[PDB]
Design a protein around this ligand. Sequence first.
Ligand SMILES: Nc1nc2c(ncn2[C@@H]2O[C@H](COP(=O)(O)O[C@@H]3[C@H](O)[C@@H](COP(=O)(O)OP(=O)(O)OP(=O)(O)O)O[C@H]3n3cnc4c(=O)[nH]c(N)nc43)[C@@H](O)[C@H]2O)c(=O)[nH]1
Ligand SMILES: [Zn+2]
Length: 326
Amino acid sequence: GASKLRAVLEKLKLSRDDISTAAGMVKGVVDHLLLRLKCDSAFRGVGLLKISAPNEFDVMFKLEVPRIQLEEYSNTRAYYFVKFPLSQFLEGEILSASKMLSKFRKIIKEEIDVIMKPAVTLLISEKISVDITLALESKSSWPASTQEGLRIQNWLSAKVRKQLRLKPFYLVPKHAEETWRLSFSHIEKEILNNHGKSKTCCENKEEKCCRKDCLKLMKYLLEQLKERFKDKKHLDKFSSYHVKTAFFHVCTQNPQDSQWDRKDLGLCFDNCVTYFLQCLRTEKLENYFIPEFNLFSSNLIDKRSKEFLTKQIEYERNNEFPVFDE
Ligand SMILES: Nc1nc2c(ncn2[C@@H]2O[C@H](COP(=O)(O)O[C@@H]3[C@H](O)[C@@H](COP(=O)(O)OP(=O)(O)OP(=O)(O)O)O[C@H]3n3cnc4c(=O)[nH]c(N)nc43)[C@@H](O)[C@H]2O)c(=O)[nH]1
Ligand SMILES: [Zn+2]
């Protein structure tokens, strides 16, 4: 379906000045929050670690904490308690996510045409929504639950996995409670931008793969379907993170750049859609870094919404995506 999909990618490029100038003011607001945040004892040394869905922007504020100790919350491989001026957020020996997240919020309140709402949400001039997520930074080795994650050996190399896992990891105050959740959104950006088996993937005309186009098509497929099913709101829980995560699994499944040749955009997209479909139908989408953390368990998304999106994605697939027409 190259023609139809290439037309879609060409349509998306048309809003490139909208995504830029809208994030162009996200910038000057985030720098302003960063300035006065660095004036508070607890948030000194905070710094910047972007577009989720047209006009939905995400910024992560990283904060360097001293040596950190993690206790896995129950058997949820992603959620943890945290222990070691930061002393003010303590609940005994653990560091209170809910309480730290709370002072963050209030410092941004007195700093704010912007208005409020793990994410603190701003609204710049009504159109532009910004997610501002506080991230604790740990330079310790990654937690045990990531040992079998990041299965990039056959795709990027074994040595690249070793380089990636020497980098810090992050905890956002997202409670399953004073609990924090692992974050590797910095690693997600690295493997997205440095995505080939060939180190020179997409640096010359002989190596133009279609990995990034497939993810765009997949993000756009979900955005369009979510728009169409706005009457009965069955798709509210699915995000482009479910799409990005599935796209990482397909990259692991098709590790060679030859499996992402631009000429094959139609078949590559089909691989992304079929694997996403298998995830919905088996109620299993593994976090790329934490395999025993199922983003699609009936815990997070009930079975009816998943069965719903299957049928729609299945119909779209079997009919050469009429959602992409005209
Ligand atoms: N976006 C995102 N999701 C991630 C990441 N790593 C794991 N996940 C998990 O993927 C699922 C997709 O969620 P979403 O993006 O559609 O929405 C998530 C989350 O569900 C929502 C908060 O909803 P809540 O449960 O009602 O509240 P919460 O428990 O967060 O409240 P509190 O903070 O008081 O505890 O927020 C979205 N979200 C999650 N993490 C982030 C993040 O880092 N940035 C932004 N902008 N939004 C986020 C979910 O199951 C999710 O956990 C990951 O890196 N990104
Ligand atoms: Zn490439």
